[PDB]
């Protein structure tokens, strides 16, 4: 009932990582800020963002949202591979069909939240993952991963943000801000900066919305006494760097021992680290890690913090722990395996 508002990059391209920063200002109930959108009308169509599901403030139900529509070219189901502790996966229907993950998340007005999605190929399927950085708390969280049963799909086209009223409370104002929009290109793994974006009301004949920019962010609002100062829409440019500011992967190894024919290797990322994408461990029979490993543990997931494995090992082994973050930064540590360690 409030008119929709779309904020669209001028220069987006097919991507495997998409990122934007968002801050809520006015939060009417029944508002979805879908900060990422992809593949509309197409294979692996989806979106993700933030909702005010009820109430006008922090005492209402505030959530993250993530949905992918059912495959066109397969009868196989989308799987919810991982959901965070405050996340719930369910099948949606009556609006096409597909999978959504709704996550209770206590986001706050005038604070910034970075939503970063990554898509990757694995096992002949495509995975889509949702990560969120609470900027004020300097903390990343893995929210959910969907396993889509079609290969070679990406965030191919259609990058945009919308603010929408889904229930019909047009008297109530909704307003938010965005900045730091970036994609990682499929073509060359370089970053594209969405420094120029267009703000445009959904209904050309409805001016009950507004938008603009400061030096730091784009802002938009709709509903109530909102009235456009920019006609049907306008393009704005932010002074963001051509390259995104990417943190560092940093972790502590917490165990590395072998006892009673069980190998246990675990770690904890620092609270200030970029989030874990994947891990691998190679076990060598020698300190220099020459030759072939005697054992390899592959495909440790984003949501796994190490291994416990029934295994036979000789006396003097060494572990090569190779962790990679969601930005493909790798940090490798070598650790001597403590033979007997509860002991």
């Amino acid at each position: 009932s409030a008119p929709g508002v779309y904020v669209t990059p001028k220069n987006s391209v097919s991507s495997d990582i998409i990122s934007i920063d968002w801050s809520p200002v006015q939060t009417a109930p029944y508002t979805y800020w879908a900060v990422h959108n992809w593949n509309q009308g197409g294979e692996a169509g989806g979106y993700a963002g933030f909702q005010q599901q009820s109430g006008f403030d922090e005492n209402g139900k505030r959530t993250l949202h993530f949905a992918v529509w059912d495959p066109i070219s397969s009868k196989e189901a989308i799987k919810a591979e991982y959901v965070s502790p405050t996340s719930v996966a369910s099948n949606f229907g009556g609006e096409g069909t597909g999978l959504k993950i709704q996550t209770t998340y206590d986001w706050k007005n005038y604070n910034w939240y970075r939503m970063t999605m990554r898509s990757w190929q694995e096992n002949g399927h495509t995975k889509f993952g949702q990560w969120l950085k609470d900027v004020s708390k300097n903390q990343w969280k893995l929210i959910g991963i969907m396993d889509f049963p079609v290969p070679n799909v990406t965030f191919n086209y259609g990058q945009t943000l919308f603010q929408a009223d889904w229930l019909g409370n047009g008297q109530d104002v909704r307003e938010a801000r965005v900045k730091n929009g970036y994609g990682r290109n499929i073509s060359d793994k370089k970053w594209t900066s969405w420094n120029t974006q267009s703000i445009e009301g959904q209904e050309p004949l409805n001016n009950n919305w507004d938008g603009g920019a400061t030096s730091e962010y784009l802002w938009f609002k709709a509903g109530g006494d909102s009235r456009s100062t920019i006609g049907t829409g306008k393009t704005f440019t932010l002074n963001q760097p051509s390259q995104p500011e990417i943190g560092k992967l940093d972790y502590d190894v917490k165990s590395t021992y072998y006892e009673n024919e069980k190998l246990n290797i675990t770690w904890q990322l620092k609270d200030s680290s970029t989030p874990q994408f994947k891990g691998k461990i190679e076990i060598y029979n020698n300190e220099n890690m020459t030759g072939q490993p005697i054992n390899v543990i592959n495909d440790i997931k984003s949501y796994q913090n190490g291994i416990s494995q029934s295994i036979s090992l000789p006396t003097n082994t060494y572990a090569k722990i190779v962790l990679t973050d969601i930005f493909d930064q790798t940090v490798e540590k070598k650790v001597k395996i403590k033979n007997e360690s509860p002991n």
Binding site: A34, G41, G94, G158
Partner: peptide
Amino acid sequence: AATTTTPAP
């Protein structure tokens, strides 16, 4: 209940 999108026009 529904949270729609648009296809390209």
